[PDB]
Enzyme design. Structure first.
Site, PDB file in Angstrom:
ATOM      1  N   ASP A   1     116.053   9.864  99.091  1.00 41.89           N
ATOM      2  CA  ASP A   1     115.690  10.058 100.484  1.00 41.89           C
ATOM      3  C   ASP A   1     115.017  11.418 100.582  1.00 41.89           C
ATOM      4  OD1 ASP A   1     115.378   9.008 103.039  1.00 41.89           O
ATOM      5  OD2 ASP A   1     117.461   9.406 103.690  1.00 41.89           O
TER       6      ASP A   1
ATOM      7  N   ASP B   1     123.377   6.920 109.781  1.00 42.52           N
ATOM      8  CA  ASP B   1     122.466   7.258 110.863  1.00 42.52           C
ATOM      9  C   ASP B   1     121.380   8.226 110.359  1.00 42.52           C
ATOM     10  OD1 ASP B   1     123.790   5.665 112.862  1.00 42.52           O
ATOM     11  OD2 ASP B   1     125.317   7.227 113.127  1.00 42.52           O
TER      12      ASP B   1
END
Ligand SMILES: C=CC1=C(C)/C(=C/c2[nH]c(/C=C3N=C(/C=C4\NC(=O)C(C)=C4C=C)C(C)=C\3CCC(=O)O)c(CCC(=O)O)c2C)NC1=O
Length: 210
Positions: A82, A183
């Site tokens: 990520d 999230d």
């Protein structure tokens, strides 16, 4: 272009077999053309179930999120990354061997560790002892590129020495269920592209083996 191109290149240098087999989404959204762009790619190739490659860019954001799911049969972890540039002085870099077996601590001796004090992810549950997280500036991302290539070399090694052939996507059930709990992807896409698209991106693209 992307600040990430040197990571993206090293990835497919190590894994030349990963050919696009489906362009899942090319979407425009955000402010009005659309100033937010999603490229969602799925790639297949020898020793892999899939590599799923999300790449979102707008004027401020530059996010590359990619998981390599190997074929099952060899107890191998995924490799997850990520790469998140939010502003022009805020980037977060995340990469790890992410094991499908819950609660279990995986490691590769020789690699940075970690502890593991990092707040958003739980060491030992789908994140390894050697989880790599850094906070830095856009202009300094490539300082960690060599470390990246070290994780890739190690992951290549373990694919090549085990050469899995299984296709049991249910092995990744617990993993993708867990990752869907993270999230903010759901809401970021909600706002940027709409509800239908956020739901589908998350459940049908990002984490689809639930
Ligand atoms: C794939 C698309 C994707 C998008 C659109 C995304 C957006 C995104 N991620 C953020 C933070 C973050 N996002 C993550 C990680 C994730 N968050 C997720 O939704 C997922 C699936 C992961 C990891 C696999 C983490 C760890 C932070 C911490 C930021 C911080 O350091 O505070 C933020 C800053 C605001 C906030 O924390 O609410 C945004 C806007 N991240 C993404 O990975």
């Amino acid at each position: 272009k992307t600040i990430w191109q040197n990571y993206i290149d090293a990835l497919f240098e190590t894994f030349p077999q990963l050919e696009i087999s489906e362009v899942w989404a090319k979407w425009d959204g955000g402010n009005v053309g659309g100033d937010a762009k999603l490229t969602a790619n799925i790639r297949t190739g020898e020793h892999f179930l899939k590599a799923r490659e999300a790449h979102i860019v707008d004027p401020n954001s530059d996010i590359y999120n990619t998981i390599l799911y190997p074929k099952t049969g060899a107890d191998l972890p995924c490799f997850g990354m990520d790469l998140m540039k939010f502003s022009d002085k805020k980037v977060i870099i995340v990469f790890d061997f992410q094991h499908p077996r819950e609660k279990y601590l995986f490691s590769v001796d020789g690699l940075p560790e970690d502890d593991g004090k990092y707040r958003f992810f739980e060491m030992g549950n789908h994140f390894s002892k050697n989880i790599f997280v850094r906070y830095c500036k856009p202009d300094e991302v490539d300082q960690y590129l060599d470390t990246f290539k070290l994780y890739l070399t190690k992951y290549k090694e373990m694919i090549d020495n085990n050469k899995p052939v299984g296709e049991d996507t249910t092995v990744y059930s617990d993993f993708d269920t867990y990752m869907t709990e993270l999230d903010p992807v759901r809401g970021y896409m909600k706002n940027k592209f709409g509800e239908g698209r956020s739901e589908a991106f998350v459940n049908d693209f990002l984490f689809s083996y639930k």
